[PDB]
Amino acid sequence: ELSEAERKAVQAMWARLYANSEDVGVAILVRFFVNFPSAKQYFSQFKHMEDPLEMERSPQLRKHASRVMGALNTVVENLHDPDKVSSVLALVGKAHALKHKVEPVYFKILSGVILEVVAEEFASDFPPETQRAWAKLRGLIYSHVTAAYKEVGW
Ligand code: HEM
């Protein structure tokens, strides 16, 4: 699915991102929760937060951002090993289906926010090939997470 060069474009850009994983990741989630306030129903500590300035300072928000960034780091760094990606994404899917009861579509929506922010951040380094690489990564995340929701009885 993801070629050699496409793998390499994602990984090179991800390294640039992860050098401020903590600022990037919360910026993403703040944006996500601002533009899709429904998604915040699942988080006890900020379900009623509206202020972005407060959302950015919330430890539970920040924890989720660090955890999402950690999981995707595992996926991005191991794109060459398809079964480490399957297992990471299956743990995540199942957890979200069963522990957290999160509608799968919020994965789609979050991913779209991720892509918006990566495009903004690397606007001067986002040629078609690189857009394609990220699009396939996004699509692969959604398959495995969807497949996991089915496997568990959603
Ligand atoms: C790339 C997508 C995502 C990844 C990789 C991810 C990953 C994780 C991880 C690793 C954890 C900690 C382990 C666990 O409790 O399962 C977690 C917790 C959690 N996640 Fe996600 N997540 C993603 C998207 C979402 C979305 C879209 C929502 C809902 C809109 C969500 C809601 C939650 C909730 C409610 C928790 C428990 C938070 C807490 O205990 O404070 N996640 N997630």
Ligand SMILES: [Xe]
């Ligand atoms: Xe994130």
Ligand SMILES: [Xe]
């Ligand atoms: Xe990602």
Ligand SMILES: [Xe]
């Ligand atoms: Xe990201």
Ligand SMILES: [Xe]
């Ligand atoms: Xe993504």
